[PDB]
Design a protein around this ligand. Structure first.
Ligand SMILES: [Mg+2]
Ligand SMILES: [Mg+2]
Ligand SMILES: [Mg+2]
Ligand SMILES: [Mg+2]
Ligand SMILES: [Mg+2]
Ligand SMILES: [Zn+2]
Ligand SMILES: [Zn+2]
Lengths: 205, 52, 70, 36, 67, 100, 137
RNA sequence: ACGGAAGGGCACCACCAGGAGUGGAGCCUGCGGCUUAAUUUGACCAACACGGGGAAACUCACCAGGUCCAGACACAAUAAGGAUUGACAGAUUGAGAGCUCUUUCUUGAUUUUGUGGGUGGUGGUGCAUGGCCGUUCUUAGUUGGUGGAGUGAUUUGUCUGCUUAAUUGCGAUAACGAACGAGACCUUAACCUACUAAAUAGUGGUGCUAGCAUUUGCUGGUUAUCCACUUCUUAGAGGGACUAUCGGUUUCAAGCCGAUGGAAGUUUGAGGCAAUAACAGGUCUGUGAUGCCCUUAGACGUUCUGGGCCGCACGCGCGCUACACUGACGGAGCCAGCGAGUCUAACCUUGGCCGAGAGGUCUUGGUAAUCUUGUGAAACUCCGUCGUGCUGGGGAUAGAGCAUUGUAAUUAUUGCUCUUCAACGAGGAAUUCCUAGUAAGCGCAAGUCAUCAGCUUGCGUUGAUUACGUCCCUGCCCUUUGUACACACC
């Protein structure tokens, strides 16, 4: 059917996204984009580091193509992956969440890592950022530390339109810490979709 | 070998969430086969969105 | 894991010619999709091969993706 | 609790896939091979 | 209630502060030039601004009002 | 010539109408006759679930929606051009099924 | 020549053609709408403007989609709108205006469709506003 | 921050005016209690038809029992002269179980055994957590820059008053100019004889022309039967409302109240999203999310059999059916909308046939605006029987028989036919929800589903009464004030 076909395609995309999130974490994975063409299925994965995805001249790309092939029962040659560098750099909430997770896993003060992430996001053109760290920073009542810089909206369609939100579970030797990153991109340099706020009224003379 | 399988072709034990393997809160509409919590988590990822 | 030696040789044959195997987490599956052995043998024999290296296991919604190393 | 008595140093039936190493066990009137 | 917020009242006020030798006290022609002299991102907000501008113009001819 | 029916289906309205217009224009520059693109009603795959991952709190329900929008365009053309029309439609997100 | 009428969800399509006073509702005469009490509710747009007043027009409605009363109101307004549109197109404009004024001076949504639509139901209770009964102890 | 001080304000989770009720009866369901081998457990406004929790098996986590390692991997030892595995037949067992034994085959370095070290857990900790969610909050609150006040922490801005749903705005004024929230926004339900296009939608007329009437008129019918179109329907792009106009009331206005026009004048109706934050609120019983603890081969892992979760002196909550004539029953009228539905195979089912019924059989259409389906729903309407009675209202309890689903209906799954016809004569103290297509009545689709609704989520049918306010009660917010609190009244 069609009702089932598109739901299955959405589940297929979700499965690929979770698979690449678990697999290519050290590769700076940012997002999957399946392009189902009649001839072949061009799944394009967008990561910040598209050389650790290639490996030894395409070994890792080949093995990832074969992994998705042998999971989703395709005919050899009817699917292919494509590693792509994200034109959207640390403006990307998932990329910054993974950066913070890796800094907190290899060892870095929580406040310093959050400030570094916020500084990088802001200096990369972003119109506002917010990083929330919830859990046992040092074994306690598990307070939640917020670090927000700039302008941010929280309600209405604009939050879907221009806001990127990502959460991440960091697992240290004491409990689990939730890392939430909210990046508000500047609507003026959107290059697609609405280019201003709904209430932004500009007059000329 | 001949005792390790009671038949599970129907009922709540026949199907599990494709993500978390839970037999409760399963959503079998449109062939999702996802637990009612895992679907809330990965809802935007499938194409289901909140409008009203 | 008590598996016919031969029954493990085909596992390594397939795993080495292809380089990838995606085993559904079904301990009762009578036969694996790609290898003519039960998925229980596939998963646990390979798990045993993952404790010596040369195999990395990801789960990704209960499907046991295995990739070899060099 | 499989004891597996040591079985220290020591015919043929149907199901011809047997490779003539399936010598029958004789308790009484046992015409079924070692396999089946 | 039908009270108008800042984004309507201030926008209408500025529209009068820069377009007095302009749109009359009729809403139909008040909303038309709003599209060319203002980049409103929703027709409902445009209608709200044009209506408040019309009201302000209708009450400006009977005594100057603050601001 | 061969009479066919091209069915376009997707959840993105802009991306679906992009191909639903590209096909029409690519048949106009080739000057065929077609029964205009028919817009079958959008199917809202609404699904209601419980907000709570547990059994505590006010009983709050939330419905998600998947709007499947479908369209169908029937025309006639020979093989060499109908294949070009079925190869122009590569829009990501829209699936295209041709039936003879 | 072709008008419509809706009350809540029922839609009645009226075809007004040059003819001789044939008023059909579903293939039957107007005397067989049969709620047995709203027959005068379907008689309203005739006795309002003119007793017969019409040997030149024929009205044929077809109604579907609602309930009994919704369809009755839908036809009672569809035939009135068909008469108004017929006078608008062919017969006369001052006649149309006088007959529309006569309709509006008795207006029971004979000319304008009722705007009331069913309010969506919200969780936590049957109906759009009524809530499930709550107990404290 | 709190207070058991005060003052303002808001609110059908408060009231006033009312409607429907509940509480009274029976039954369904959940909770407690009690019982039990187990009656698994979480939860006590913001628990109690809640865990999408409608449990025969499974789910299952409880109980009585029974198998297996699915104990990685070192490492030793066992072992290439055999470490280990499986076994037909009998005892044993519920079991056609090589579990264990009577017995001797079979396989062959994969594992027994240690030895470390893994792994799993619906085991504990929601007072160690993440995420999510609920509540505060169907509330309006929160915060920079410059300036002013203070030595300073800080304060004003962020307010006497009015208005608003709103820190909504007017206005007042050491503030001015702004930001988050509100609003804007998005979705949907309204209209649009306007644009586009539709044998997957409909309407007009041509031949196919069966009926009635017979000067051609009504309704009929023609899924490959012609032409034209989009009024009905669909959905893209747009339009439309912005409280428009006109009066009155405003102190100066924001606004409010009426009338007219309008499709729509109560944020146009309803939702989604929703700031600073606070709770030791719920969830480790969703998670291959998880710290720590417990267990880990007589397992708390996993599996199988059976039972239990439903168990009954009793109390409570959400509900269904009623107490009848504005009704019951029998014939007839035959009117929706939201939706779902099978290609690796068993779903929605049209039609024919059999049957009193449930239901059974042969096909058909549908992977779907095509077929189920026009969901020929119910309430409702008409005409009859009943005659106000513990009655023909009411259908609790039980017996017999017939089918369906299911490996398996006993503790009745459910449906069907017959038969007994229990309380209940309008429900005390108390108490819930609700202001217009809303309450209420009524049914339908979906979810849970192999089967099972009295549950929920939506949908549509019929459509009131009363009110257009208030702080009397309750709850909350703000302000003032007290503090010996700051781990902030635990
Ligand atoms: Mg909002
Ligand atoms: Mg267990
Ligand atoms: Mg202040
Ligand atoms: Mg129970
Ligand atoms: Mg339930
Ligand atoms: Zn799940
Ligand atoms: Zn043999």
């Amino acid at each position: 059917s069609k009702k089932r076909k598109l739901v299955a395609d959405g589940v297929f995309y979700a499965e690929l996204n979770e698979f690449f999130t678990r697999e290519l974490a050290e590769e700076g994975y940012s997002g999957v984009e399946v392009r189902v063409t009649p001839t072949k299925t061009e799944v394009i994965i967008r990561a910040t580091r598209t050389q650790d995805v290639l490996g030894e001249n395409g070994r890792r790309i080949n093995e990832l193509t074969l992994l998705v092939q042998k999971r989703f029962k395709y005919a050899p040659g009817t699917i292919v992956l494509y590693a792509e560098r994200v034109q959207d750099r640390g403006l990307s909430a998932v990329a910054q969440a993974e950066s913070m997770k890796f800094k907190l896993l290899n060892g870095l003060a929580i406040r310093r890592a959050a400030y570094g992430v916020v500084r990088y996001v802001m200096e990369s053109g972003a119109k506002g950022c917010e990083v929330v760290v919830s859990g046992k920073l040092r074994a306690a009542r598990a307070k939640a530390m917020k670090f927000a810089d700039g302008f941010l909206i929280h309600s209405g369609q604009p939050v879907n339109d221009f806001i990127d939100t990502a959460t991440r579970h960091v697992l240290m030797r004491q409990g689990v810490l939730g890392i939430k990153v909210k990046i508000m991109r500047d609507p003026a340099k959107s290059r697609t979709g609405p280019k201003a706020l709904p209430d932004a009224v500009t007059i000329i003379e | 070998n001949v005792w390790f399988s009671h038949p599970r072709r129907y009922g709540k034990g026949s199907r599990q969430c494709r993500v978390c393997s839970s037999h409760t809160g399963l959503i079998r509409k449109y062939g999702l086969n996802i637990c009612r919590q895992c679907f809330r988590e990965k809802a935007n990822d499938i194409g289901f969105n909140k409008f009203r | 894991m008590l598996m016919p030696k031969e029954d493990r040789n085909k596992i390594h044959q397939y795993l080495f010619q292809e380089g990838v195997v995606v085993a559904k987490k079904d301990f009762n599956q009578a036969k694996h999709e790609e290898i003519d052995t039960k998925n229980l043998y596939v998963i646990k024999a390979l798990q045993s091969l993952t404790s010596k290296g040369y195999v990395k296991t990801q789960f990704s919604w209960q499907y046991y993706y295995y990739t070899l190393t060099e | 609790k499989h004891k597996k008595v040591k079985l220290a140093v020591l015919r043929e039936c149907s199901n011809p896939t047997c490779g003539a190493g399936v010598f029958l066990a004789n308790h009484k009137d046992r015409l079924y091979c070692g396999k089946c | 209630g039908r009270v108008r917020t800042k984004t309507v009242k201030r926008a209408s006020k500025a529209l009068i502060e820069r377009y007095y030798p302009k749109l009359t006290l009729d809403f139909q022609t008040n909303k038309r030039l709003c599209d060319e002299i203002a980049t409103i991102q929703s027709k409902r907000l445009r209608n709200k601004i044009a209506g408040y501008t019309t009201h302000l113009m209708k009450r400006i001819q009977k005594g100057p009002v603050r601001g | 010539i061969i009479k066919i029916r091209i069915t376009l289906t997707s959840t993105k309205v802009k991306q679906l109408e992009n191909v639903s217009s590209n096909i029409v224009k690519n048949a106009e520059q080739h000057n065929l006759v077609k029964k205009g693109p028919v817009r079958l009603p959008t199917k809202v795959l609404k699904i209601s679930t419980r907000k709570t991952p547990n059994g505590e709190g006010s009983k709050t329900w939330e419905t998600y929606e998947m709007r499947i929008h479908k369209r169908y365009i029937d025309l006639e053309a020979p093989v060499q051009i109908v294949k070009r029309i079925t190869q122009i439609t590569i829009e990501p997100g829209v699936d295209v099924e041709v039936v003879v | 020549v072709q008008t419509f009428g809706k009350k809540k969800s029922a839609t009645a399509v009226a075809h007004v053609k040059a003819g001789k006073g044939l008023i059909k509702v579903n293939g039957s005469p107007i005397t067989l709408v049969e709620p047995e009490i709203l027959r005068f509710k379907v008689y309203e747009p005739l006795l309002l403007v003119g007793l017969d007043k019409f040997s030149n027009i024929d009205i044929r409605v077809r109604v579907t989609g609602g309930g009994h009363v919704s369809q009755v109101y839908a036809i009672r307004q569809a035939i009135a709108k068909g008469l108004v549109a017929y006078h608008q197109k062919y017969v006369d404009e001052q006649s149309k205006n006088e007959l529309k004024k006569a309709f509006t001076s008795y207006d029971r949504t004979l000319l304008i469709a009722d705007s009331r639509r069913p309010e969506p139901k919200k969780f936590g209770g049957k109906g759009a506003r009524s809530r499930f009964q709550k107990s404290y102890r």
